Each structure stands twice: as structure tokens, then as C-alpha cells.
Amino acid sequence: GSHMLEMIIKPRVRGFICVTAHPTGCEANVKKQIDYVTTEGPIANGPKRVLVIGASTGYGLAARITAAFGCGADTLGVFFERPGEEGKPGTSGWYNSAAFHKFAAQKGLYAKSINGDAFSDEIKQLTIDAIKQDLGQVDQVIYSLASPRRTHPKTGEVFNSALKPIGNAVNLRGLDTDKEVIKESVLQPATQSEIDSTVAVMGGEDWQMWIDALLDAGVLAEGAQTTAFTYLGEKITHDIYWNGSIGAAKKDLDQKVLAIRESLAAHGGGDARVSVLKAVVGQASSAIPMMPLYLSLLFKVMKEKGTHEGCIEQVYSLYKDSLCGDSPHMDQEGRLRADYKELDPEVQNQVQQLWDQVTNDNIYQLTDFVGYKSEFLNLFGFGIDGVDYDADVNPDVKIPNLIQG
Ligand SMILES: NC(=O)C1=CN([C@@H]2O[C@H](COP(=O)(O)OP(=O)(O)OC[C@H]3O[C@@H](n4cnc5c(N)ncnc54)[C@H](O)[C@@H]3O)[C@@H](O)[C@H]2O)C=CC1
């Protein structure tokens, strides 16, 4: 009985985390993103050898798809995901990457991946080894890691990021997606240890270590380009994000990009940019219970303007308009901006007005909580058109050219 080794996979939510993922739906979700890119069409003058650090979900996956299927790039991806086992579905990023390798091969594109802690020196060395064997050098490095923790590669100290305001405590309104209630909670201000730790995790040091490793090992091409992703948002999120602990980390990136640009700009006119992207649903949205509410409002407002987008739409335009084209959406500290439609004054004014009106009773009248919930499930391969969720699947989906760290 093959059925002994297969199962019907359904969403299982433990609080705010979906702990299952559907391999067929994840494949279909990747193909939907690829098909968006191929439908919008190729991007000229892009990189042809791309390293994506954090390439398995979210914005890093979108960059990997954009580079490969938009720019025709060979792509080496680094991520940290759990393979499937019998009776135990792997993480969505595992299945996403399996699909990516499948579709890349179909198009005659190289796809190799490294599964392991990108903060460590060993993973950096495995990545260098892979570039040397296969690509010689890479033309572009996407830095798209998101983690709540970082094990320092030298000291071994384990840093945990904090998601707190700075200075004063703040009352943050939010949406509990389990209870489906609007709820306010008071977050205490970050300690200095919490700030320093968040800067260590989501700051720019590891990005810098990556680039200096590739340079020292000589696998960074003359003039190569590198970008790290960031979020600024608008006032509604300023207290906890931009001006809070995680914002102190993102502020470390506007400093680090300058030293990185210095090194690349001497290397055949390469370039480096912090790239600012819009808010989207991700696996850990509810890491701030404010974000499900903000997203539900933002979605409705932007859908009414025809400007709602997800990861792949955002990153495709980042590549076509700014990383490769001559509409480089530059701002005053030299950041590439793709988030301008979210920050539109009238959008933010409308989101603000609705923020003050939303209650337990009018959530579905005032917000796109429906859309938030659907896009959340889509991350894990659920709710996808054309998938037969009644069919058995083997959760142990394997990936060729997957280097296990
Ligand atoms: N709304 C959003 O989610 C926004 C996110 N951003 C930025 O985009 C970047 C990606 O964020 P998301 O797409 O939200 O996250 P994500 O959770 O979807 O993916 C994070 C990636 O990092 C990888 N990763 C995590 N820890 C790792 C480790 N120790 N070693 C190797 N790989 C590891 C994961 O496998 C995955 O590939 C971040 O810099 C984030 O600040 C920017 C704007 C908005």
C-alpha cells in the first residue's frame, strides 16, 4: 500500500502558525509566480549569475523567480527549511524550492540550493564552493534573510531579535486571527540589550560578512550588484517598526550599504542598494498582531485603487524598474524604493481613517480580512486553483542539487 507512505494534507494552525504545507499547492503557487513573470515578459540587462540568500519563501523566492524566469539567470539559493518525512509535511519553503528546481530545469536554467544556517561561516564556504565549481562568479547577490535569531559565527552567542518600541511603551491595536477579535496590547520599550540583539540579527553585519567572504574568496564578479530588502511603512507602523527595535536594525542597513557600494563601485562599476518593499502577508505575519489588521486594511484600500500586489509583482518591478532599468526609484539616503504605492498619501489617509473605525463587528465590512486569510493559506500551498486537496500525496519531496549544511 503506497497509501501507508502518503497522506491527505490539510492546514493545521497552532495559534498563529500553520504547521503543515501542501507540496502540490506550493508547486502551483511557485508556478503562478513564474507565470506572472513570463507573462509580464523578459527583463533586459539583468544579472545572469545570481546568489539569493533567503531564497525559499516570500521576497527572496520572488527575487529568485524574477532573476531566473525574468532575467534568464542561473541561480544559487540559500535557505533554512525542513524536508518532508512520512506523515510529517516539510516546510512550505522546502516544497517551494523543490518546485523551483523542477521548473528551472524545464527552462534549461541552473538551479542549485544550499539548506543551512546562512549566518555561519561554513554555509558561506559551501556557497563559495558551489559558485567556483559551477558559475565561476556571481553578478548579483540578493540578501533576503528573515529570522528571529542569529548564532554569531565567531562568538557563538545566540542573539534573539526583539519586536518592541523604543523610548516609551505603546498601545498597539491588532487582529488576533485565531479568535478573530480586534485586540489592543501594550508593548514595553526595548532594553539596550534587546536593541543591540535585534541589530545583530536583522542588521547589516551578516550581509557585509557575506560580501567580504565572496570578495576574499574571489567569487564576486568585477562590478557585481547586491541589495538587501527592508520595510519602512508609514506612520501607523512607525512606533514598532521603523522607530522600534526592528527599525534600529533596518537603520543599520542604510549605513552598511555605503561600505558595500564602495567595494563594488571600484569593482567595475558595481552597485549596492537597500531596497524598500511593501508590506505583504508572510508566514509570521502576526509576529506583530498589528500586521494582520494593517494588511487587511491595506489590501482593501489598494484593491479599490487597482494597486494591490504581492511578492512577485513587487520584485519583478524592482528588477525591471530599478535594479536593471533606467527608472531607478531613488530616495534621499540612496535606497531603491518599490513601496511608493503603499505610501501614497491618500491610501495611508484611508487606512488611517479605517484603522480608527474597525471593530469586532465590522471587520468584514471595513477590511479585506477575507483576502488576508486566503493569501495566508496560499503561502503554505492551500486554497490554490487546480489542486485536488482530496488526493493523497507523498510528503517526502526530494530536491536534486540540494546541498545539506
Ligand atoms: N511584509 C514583509 O514581509 C516585508 C519584508 N521585507 C523584507 O524582506 C526580507 C524577507 O522577508 P520575508 O519575505 O518577510 O520573510 P520569509 O520568512 O518569507 O523568508 C525568509 C527567508 O530567510 C530564510 N532563512 C531564515 N533564517 C535563515 C538562516 N538562519 N539561514 C538561512 N536561511 C534562513 C528562510 O528560509 C527564507 O528563505 C526581509 O529582509 C524583510 O525585512 C520588506 C518589506 C516587507
Side-chain angles (χ1 to χ4, degrees):
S2 69
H3 49 101
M4 309 178 110
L5 296 175
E6 296 179 347
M7 56 185 293
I8 292 172
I9 296 168
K10 304 169 192 281
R12 301 178 71 248
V13 172
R14 287 217 232 90
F16 311 109
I17 309 171
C18 185
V19 303
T20 60
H22 195 287
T24 312
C26 286
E27 172 167 334
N29 201 36
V30 166
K31 194 202 169 44
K32 182 192 204 185
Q33 297 178 61
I34 293 166
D35 291 351
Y36 174 85
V37 170
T38 62
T39 288
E40 294 293 309
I43 298 170
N45 298 117
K48 306 297 164 152
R49 303 173 295 169
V50 177
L51 168 64
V52 183
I53 304 155
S56 55
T57 59
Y59 272 131
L61 175 64
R64 201 187 182 162
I65 289 166
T66 296
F69 298 93
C71 299
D74 294 332
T75 62
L76 177 62
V78 179
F79 51 75
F80 190 77
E81 301 292 349
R82 187 186 61 249
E85 306 181 278
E86 181 189 337
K88 295 161 180 171
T91 53
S92 70
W94 182 265
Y95 296 138
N96 294 340
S97 302
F100 182 95
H101 281 226
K102 176 188 172 172
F103 294 131
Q106 285 177 358
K107 269 275 110 66
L109 299 176
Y110 164 108
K112 179 183 271 189
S113 292
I114 297 167
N115 190 31
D117 177 14
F119 289 122
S120 68
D121 294 332
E122 294 83 348
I123 296 300
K124 295 176 166 61
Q125 186 52 53
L126 295 174
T127 305
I128 285 157
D129 293 340
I131 300 163
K132 286 197 199 230
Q133 176 191 21
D134 298 329
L135 308 176
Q137 309 191 298
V138 293
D139 306 310
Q140 184 188 62
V141 178
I142 303 306
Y143 194 82
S144 189
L145 287 185
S147 180
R149 74 197 90 241
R150 172 187 178 206
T151 297
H152 197 271
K154 310 291 161 172
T155 75
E157 173 175 8
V158 176
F159 293 96
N160 292 290
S161 75
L163 306 176
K164 293 181 166 190
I166 293 176
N168 294 22
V170 309
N171 171 4
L172 288 190
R173 188 174 297 147
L175 167 60
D176 179 328
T177 56
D178 189 50
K179 274 60 263 214
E180 305 201 347
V181 301
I182 307 299
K183 170 63 169 56
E184 284 177 354
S185 64
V186 177
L187 284 176
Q188 290 303 300
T191 73
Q192 190 60 49
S193 176
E194 286 172 332
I195 291 170
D196 295 3
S197 291
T198 306
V199 171
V201 174
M202 288 302 287
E205 176 173 81
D206 178 70
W207 184 22
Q208 173 155 228
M209 284 164 168
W210 270 101
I211 283 160
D212 289 348
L214 301 159
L215 284 168
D216 288 10
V219 298
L220 204 46
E222 214 72 15
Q225 180 195 66
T226 183
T227 189
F229 298 155
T230 194
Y231 180 74
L232 273 64
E234 203 30 67
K235 285 194 154 193
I236 245 187
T237 56
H238 75 307
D239 279 330
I240 18 72
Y241 201 99
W242 187 242
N243 283 326
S245 53
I246 190 69
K250 298 317 218 161
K251 287 151 177 171
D252 181 39
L253 292 164
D254 288 332
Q255 177 142 319
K256 294 293 188 289
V257 71
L258 298 177
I260 300 174
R261 199 183 291 145
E262 193 71 19
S263 57
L264 291 165
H267 191 72
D271 190 40
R273 305 281 161 169
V274 178
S275 290
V276 191
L277 312 173
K278 79 184 213 65
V280 296
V281 186
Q283 303 162 266
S285 301
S286 73
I288 334 206
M290 144 167 226
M291 285 311 313
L293 184 51
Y294 179 71
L295 290 163
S296 289
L297 287 165
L298 184 68
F299 284 16
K300 183 163 179 184
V301 173
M302 297 186 76
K303 284 184 176 180
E304 286 182 355
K305 290 168 183 299
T307 54
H308 178 62
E309 292 184 335
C311 294
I312 195 67
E313 294 89 0
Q314 275 275 291
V315 173
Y316 181 92
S317 81
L318 183 72
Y319 268 78
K320 189 182 209 161
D321 300 341
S322 289
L323 297 177
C324 311
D326 223 337
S327 285
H329 222 286
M330 290 264 51
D331 74 19
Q332 272 199 239
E333 186 127 11
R335 302 190 211 83
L336 295 178
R337 306 300 290 257
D339 61 335
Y340 43 88
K341 292 298 184 182
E342 171 179 353
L343 307 196
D344 176 284
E346 180 57 34
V347 172
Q348 287 297 312
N349 170 248
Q350 285 190 29
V351 171
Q352 182 64 72
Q353 292 183 95
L354 292 171
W355 188 267
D356 299 328
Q357 303 172 47
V358 75
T359 58
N360 283 3
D361 283 291
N362 64 23
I363 303 178
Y364 292 106
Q365 282 70 63
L366 270 53
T367 84
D368 189 23
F369 189 33
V370 167
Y372 176 91
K373 284 196 289 192
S374 172
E375 298 195 12
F376 184 76
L377 285 173
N378 295 165
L379 293 172
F380 306 90
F382 301 109
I384 305 300
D385 292 339
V387 174
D388 183 355
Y389 288 94
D390 295 314
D392 279 12
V393 299
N394 189 323
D396 188 11
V397 174
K398 312 295 293 189
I399 304 178
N401 306 291
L402 187 294
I403 308 298
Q404 187 55 68

